Write a protein that binds this ligand. Structure first.
Ligand code: MG
Length: 421
RNA sequence: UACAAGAGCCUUUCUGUUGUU
RNA sequence: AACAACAGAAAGGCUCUUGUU
């Protein structure tokens, strides 16, 4: 159970501070964002009732959020140009298309949601596919009784939804594989509630762009009922590779794959299909174009108040397969309950990797998750695959067959935007 | 709908065993 | 083999309560 050193997280701003995570979580005090966005225009969308969420309390939340953000290196310049109340899921598309066609260069819409409602599903469906926006929805309990960590997490998600980098790793502390170009992919499938013959399954992959890996793009399609494999995975990887070359202008050499949402009992069939699928992904672009292929499937399955595993523990043997390159990583502290050391499986190893380098890469990727200043259980790309699969699940909702992947196809503006996080 | 948990609940289902014929 | 009801695991469904410096 080797606890790897957490990455000395590189922040920016006037100080260029470096955050060292202590016990798996680092504070955001006196740390400006590395690539923070000067937020030109932003919007406030209240769906909570005015009885239980007042204008003065919303303005207090806006002011204190702006203070936390200015301390965070992501400045919001002035009061929001849009601050409207609303209600109902059916009143989302007209209001969103009203706010798009009023403020040019619109960046972020903050949406206030009283708990669980179809308003979240319609808000995400309008923002990510129909119109092409970036939104940040938060509950009512976090806009009157707010904490510094709540506003910090809000600012963390807002900074990454708007094209910037919250925090790079150390370029001197990054693993040596970044000496050559790399791309990191993450895949996940969402199945509907069973007995739904008309509701299909969702296959979603995401891919990293830059050599300072904090930016991802998505590609999602719709597949048949209860299918744990992707048919057109090769087209997904090819489109992601094209987008890599288009947005970064340097030729990739390595390929990493982080498969998620796959049952344990039938790993061999999924391996057999998707490995060959990534192979025809590589050989259907140019002759002799072979990157180093590796396939890692990851499956979400003292210290602190709860007394749990410190964030960063790596297990390489004694519970693992001898010949197969599989290992466990527990990279999240136990806030309440127990922490679950994640399982990681690599059979395709032509990417030729040392072990310790590979769990260092996955641990720094876990730290690269942008929605919290703490390491998370499974890496950032497979998280973003999970949230984009759940996002397409919110996209395929009411308020065909497999010709409904026009409803899970992301807009052109948002196809670059890290909207799922 | 920040992160990490826990349980019960009834629907097709993955590993199969037992069983009147 | 199928057979109504099964023992669980794993993936996928809810719902809540357990807190941050
Ligand atoms: Mg999943």
């Amino acid at each position: 159970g080797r606890v790897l050193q957490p990455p000395s997280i590189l922040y920016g701003g006037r100080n260029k501070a470096i955050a060292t995570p202590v016990q798996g979580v680092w504070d955001m005090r006196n740390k400006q964002f590395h690539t923070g966005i000067e937020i030109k225009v932003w919007a406030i969308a209240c769906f909570a009732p005015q009885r239980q969420c007042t204008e003065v309390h919303l303005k207090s939340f806006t002011e204190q959020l702006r203070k936390i953000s200015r301390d965070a290196g992501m400045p919001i310049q002035g009061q929001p140009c849009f601050c409207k109340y609303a209600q109902g899921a059916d009143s989302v598309e007209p209001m969103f298309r009203h706010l798009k066609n009023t403020y040019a260069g619109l960046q972020l819409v903050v949406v206030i949601l009283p708990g669980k409602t179809p308003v979240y599903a319609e808000v995400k469906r309008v923002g990510d596919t129909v119109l092409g926006m970036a939104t940040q929805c938060v509950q009512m309990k976090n806009v009157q009784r707010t904490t510094p960590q709540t506003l910090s997490n809000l600012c963390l998600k807002i900074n990454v939804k708007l094209g910037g980098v919250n925090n790079i790793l150390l370029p001197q502390g990054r693993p040596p594989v970044f000496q050559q170009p790399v791309i990191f992919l993450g895949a996940d499938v969402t199945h509907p509630p069973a007995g739904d013959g008309k509701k299909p399954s969702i296959a979603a992959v995401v891919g990293s762009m830059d050599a300072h890996p904090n930016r991802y793009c998505a590609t999602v399609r719709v597949q048949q009922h209860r299918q744990e494999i992707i048919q057109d995975l090769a087209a997904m990887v090819r489109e992601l590779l094209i987008q890599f070359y288009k947005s970064t202008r340097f030729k990739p050499t390595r390929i990493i794959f982080y498969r998620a949402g796959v049952s344990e009992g039938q790993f061999q069939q999924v391996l057999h299909h998707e490995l060959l699928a990534i192979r025809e992904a590589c050989i259907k672009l140019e002759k002799d174009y072979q990157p180093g292929i590796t396939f890692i499937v990851v499956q979400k399955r003292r210290v602190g108040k709860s007394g749990n595993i410190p964030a960063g523990t790596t297990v390489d043997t004694k519970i693992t397969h001898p010949t197969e390159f599989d290992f466990y990583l527990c990279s999240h502290a136990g806030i309440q309950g127990t922490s679950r050391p994640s399982h990681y499986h690599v059979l395709w190893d032509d990417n030729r990797f040392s072990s310790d380098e590979l769990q260092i890469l996955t641990y720094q990727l876990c730290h690269t998750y942008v929605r919290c200043t703490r390491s998370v259980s499974i890496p950032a790309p497979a998280y973003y695959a999970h949230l984009v699969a759940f996002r397409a699940r919110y996209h395929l909702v009411d308020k065909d067959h497999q010709a409904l992947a026009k409803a899970v196809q992301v807009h052109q503006d948002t196809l670059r935007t890290m909207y799922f996080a």
